[PDB]
Each structure stands twice: as C-alpha cells, then as structure tokens.
Amino acid sequence: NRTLTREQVLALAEHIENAELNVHDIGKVTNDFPEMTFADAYDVQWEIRRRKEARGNKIVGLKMGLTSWAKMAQMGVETPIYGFLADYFSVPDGGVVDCSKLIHPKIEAEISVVTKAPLHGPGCHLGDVIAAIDYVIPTVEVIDSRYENFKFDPISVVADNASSTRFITGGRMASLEEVDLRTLGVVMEKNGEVVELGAGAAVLGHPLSSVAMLANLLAERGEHIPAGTFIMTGGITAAVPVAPGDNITVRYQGLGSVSARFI
C-alpha cells in the first residue's frame, strides 16, 4: 500500500516542510509522485513531524481535515484526514499572525477538545469520545497549503500536514455538560464583516465524532489518542482568506470569542 521508497519519503518530507519554513509554495507532490498512496502521504507527514521534533519543536496537538461528508465525497475520500500541530503554530487569543511567514493563509472556526482519557480504534465512536473529553475550547485554525495548485488534492494535502500552520485558541473553555456541540453556533467576522456562519454539527454531524475518526485513523498506523491530547475537530465554517491588516473575530455561542490580528 506504499509506493514511496524510504529515501523518497525523507526527501519529500524535507521538500514539503521546506516550503513551509521558507514560505515558498511548491507543486503538489502527487504530480511528481502520482502513485503516492495515503499511507505514503502519512509517512511523509509523520516524517515532517519527526523533522520538527528533531529540531526541538513540541508536538502539541492534532487537527482534522475533510470533516464534511459532502466534501469527503467530492474529494473522493471515505474518511477525514488529520495532521499535527507544532508548538510554534500556537497563537494566543487576540494575538498577532505575521502573514509574511505564511503563503496564502485562510482561517476556519473550530471547536477543539482536550481529552482526559485515552481513545483508540478501530471502532471508536462518539460514546467513547464523550466519556474522554476534559473540556472544549474555541479555536480558529489558520491553514496554509504549501502547494501552488488550485484544486484540493487530499493525498498531497496529507503529506503537507493537512495544511496546518497556526491555531488560535480563545473564548471560554467549557465541559461537555455546559455545551451542546451540535447546535453550537459560530459567527466569523473579518474586519467587522460577518463572513461565515456555522454550527458544530457541520463537523460530521457531531464534532466529537471527528475525534473518534481520528482514533480510528490513528489505529490504522498502530497509534492512538493518549489522554491529555489537544484535537482541533474540524471546520465549522468554510475557510476564509486573510491578509495583512485583517482583524478577525469569531463568536462562539455561549463561549465568548476568538480573535486575531493579521499583519
């Protein structure tokens, strides 16, 4: 189920990460390696993780992509995808994002959770996740595909760490008792303009299910979700471009707001 040699994985991971580190967009790697499988792409992504860990970055969480059934079908995929978060991805609520360090960033409103118990697959589901949640926390992701290409290419995107680049936690944390995630309304404003609306159920029908899918995806590689893991469950709103000078504020129903300033 793999077509990349070890040397190719290592080279691809270096190439792709270099696009992020040097803020330089590249051609999607599936154009040069069309035989690349998702397993290949995850091999590349996890090698990027190791590259970051090797230079001392902490891996501080995981994020989900393609958490819309409709988008999955249109991307021809059967499950979401995931990526990892590095420490330097983190932006404090109200904080600054330096667009000169990014290629073509977009933001999306999400709900993250931190688990208090381990989750594993296969066959993990909502019941398991619900019992394992410590708290939830409003989070806006800044995603930035390192590819110059227009059309989404899920295998390339996976290899590019699911386009992860920054995340902004904010608003108020709550326990699952205090929030109904399916009906959790989200309003994204950019420069004062309401640009996107969404409700938590836009993530699979239930945002917490994304965490179960994450556990099941991880199980395929003999991995699981340790207790204490921070997971961004997926895009509640469509992704919205941001540019220097933009200020954004995402309002979470009953959970305050997340904001960020782009320069």
In this complex, which beta carbon is closest to Cl ion, that of residue 97 or of residue 236? 97
Which of the listed partners (Cl ion, Mg ion, none) does 98 bind, with a CB threshold of 5 to 8 Å by partner kind?
Answer: Cl ion
Total binding residues toward Mg ion, as defined by CB under 5 A = 1
In this complex, which beta carbon is closest to Cl ion, that of residue 51 or of residue 120? 51
In this complex, which beta carbon is closest to Cl ion, that of residue 9 or of residue 208? 9
In this structure, which amino acid lies at residue 195? V
21 is in an annotated binding site: yes
Helix (H, G, I), strand (E, B) or coil at 4: coil
220 is in an annotated binding site: no
Cα–Cα distance between 30 and 8 in angstroms, integer?
Answer: 12
In this structure, which amino acid lies at residue 34? P
CB 219 within 8 A of CB 122: yes
63 is in an annotated binding site: yes
Which of the listed partners (Cl ion, Mg ion, none) does 101 bind, with a CB threshold of 5 to 8 Å by partner kind?
Answer: Cl ion
CB 230 within 8 A of CB 112: yes
Nearest distance from C-beta of residue 20 to Cl ion, angstroms: 12
The answer to whether 128 contacts Mg ion (rule: CB under 5 A) is no
Nearest distance from C-beta of residue 50 to Cl ion, angstroms: 8
Nearest distance from C-beta of residue 165 to Cl ion, angstroms: 9
Cα–Cα distance between 180 and 157 in angstroms, integer?
Answer: 31
Helices and strands of the chain, counted as H and E runs: 6, 13
In this structure, which amino acid lies at residue 229? T
189 is in an annotated binding site: no
197 is in an annotated binding site: no
Contact residue for Mg ion among 20, 43, 128, 141 (CB under 5 A): 141
Which of the listed partners (Mg ion, Cl ion, none) does 225 bind, with a CB threshold of 5 to 8 Å by partner kind?
Answer: none
Nearest distance from C-beta of residue 157 to Mg ion, angstroms: 11
Residue number of the CB closest to Mg ion reads: 141
State the residues that interact with Cl ion by CB under 5 A.
97-98, 101
Q: Please tell me whether the peptide bond between 154 and the residue prior to it is cis, using omega within 30 degrees of 0.
A: no
Closest C-alpha among 22, 70, 49, 32 to residue 158: 49
Contacts of 219 (CB under 8 A, 6+ apart): 120, 121, 122, 124
Cα–Cα distance between 211 and 128 in angstroms, integer?
Answer: 10
Nearest distance from C-beta of residue 143 to Mg ion, angstroms: 6
- Chain residues binding Mg ion by CB under 5 A are 141
